[PDB]
């Protein structure tokens with residue numbers, strides 16, 4: 157049996173552990189944190205994520221989708237909250253088969269850990285990777301106290317997240333060609349209780365947005381009707397706009413309350429613990445990191461956030477990481493050798509990771525925001541009705557299909573240009589030649 161060591165019992169690492177172990181690989185998975193399945197007297201994490209077709213299909217192949225979906229809340233569409241305007245649901249898809257799912261992060265991780273162990277993987281917690289000696293095929297791990305443990309390895313999978321220690325170790329033997337693009341927004345997680353969401357009639361089966369241009373809030377529902385709210389706001393005010401809101405200006409919880417009361421007046425009343433959440437929850441960092449190299453020969457490979465940190469504005473990081481896990485297990489299982497598998501995995505996935513990194517950055521303006529937009533949207537709707545196998549909105553290709561991300565981006569660009577051009581020099585739809593637009597659709601977009 158082929159042997160593998162995986163660092164990081166997160167989402168990608170645990171899924172690839174199950175896929176490899178059920179294929180008979182001898183799998184050892186090392187995780188820095190304690191086992192979340194061991195109940196303690198500490199409060200659980202209320203962090204949630206959007207699960208879409210890419211992630212769901214990966215779980216489906218693993219035999220875990222039904223268990224995960226049992227505690228997921230359907231989000232049928234986007235509920236936009238702008239003061240004055242009553243909220244009205246904007247469906248994401250054609251019917252309830254085209255929805256996204258809000259799931260608790262910790263619950264997803266527990267289901268994945270049980271799945272990896274059921275398939276035969278051995279999981280070792282409270283062990284953080286510190287260093288790798290590639291030439292001697294050994295690695296060093298340690299607990300929080302620095303007590304060290306050395307292990308021999310044969311194949312190393314870095315599934316250890318955006319600040320990957322495997323990635324840092326690879327940088328000692330290969331030039332990874334790393335390009336970091338910092339994101340100016342930080343984020344803060346806040347809570348809406350079940351009592352508060354019910355009192356204010358907040359729709360449970362939707363993804364909620366409070367757009368505000370350079371900043372915004374989103375809220376994803378939980379099974380118990382609580383919601384996890386995330387504020388996206390610049391860490392610092394840029395030199396050009398010193399008066400612009402930023403985390404730097406919010407010196408404490410009371411300042412955060414005044415800011416919410418002024419900028420998000422319909423949201424502030426639902427945030428009962430705003431002051432405490434603001435002071436006790438750390439402000440998170442966002443970034444895009446692009447690597448030219450994801451592997452060291454046949455010895456080590458990165459996947460998920462370890463390989464391609466992205467901004468979260470499309471809710472695709474976990475979805476992409478699970479898709480990566482399926483691809484890596486498929487390549488490893490059937491390749492001539494590990495070196496061939498890692499090179500083929502990297503060549504296949506890199507263009508797709510670049511595409512979702514670009515589309516995630518673009519989705520910020522789509523969420524945080526015109527008569528031109530409405531006309532383009534209406535025209536796009538007619539084209540989708542006339543040609544459902546050719547004109548598929550980019551959001552649907554990314555979220556409800558398994559089309560390679562690079563193809564979703566390429567077709568999305570064709571559609572965006574087609575609409576932009578067709579609406580240019582037009583006041584309304586009545587002056588637009590729909591057949592000429594449809595001719596462009598049949599000419600430029602092959603049926604899927």
Ligand SMILES: Cc1cc2nc3c(=O)[nH]c(=O)nc-3n(C[C@H](O)[C@H](O)[C@H](O)COP(=O)(O)OP(=O)(O)OC[C@H]3O[C@@H](n4cnc5c(N)ncnc54)[C@H](O)[C@@H]3O)c2cc1C
Nearest residue numbers: 164166167168188206285316317460461471472473474475
């Ligand atoms: C604000 C925000 C919202 C998001 N919302 C969504 C969403 O709605 N939908 C979506 O698809 N994605 C979302 N994402 C992205 C998603 O959280 C990540 O893309 C995803 O968790 C990556 O999975 P992963 O397994 O690669 O890494 P992780 O899930 O981060 O797992 C890495 C694991 O490695 C462990 N580890 C780290 N360092 C070491 C070490 N040295 N040794 C051993 N173990 C180590 C960690 O403890 C962890 O268990 C969001 C991200 C952010 C920041």
Ligand SMILES: Cc1cc2oc(=O)n(CCC(=O)O)c2cc1Cl
Nearest residue numbers: 206234256374468469470471523
């Ligand atoms: C954390 C997060 C998760 C998400 O899941 C998604 O599908 N989106 C896009 C929603 C839309 O454009 O309406 C999304 C955005 C964020 Cl910031």
Ligand SMILES: [Cl-]
Nearest residue numbers: 468471472473
């Ligand atoms: Cl994301």
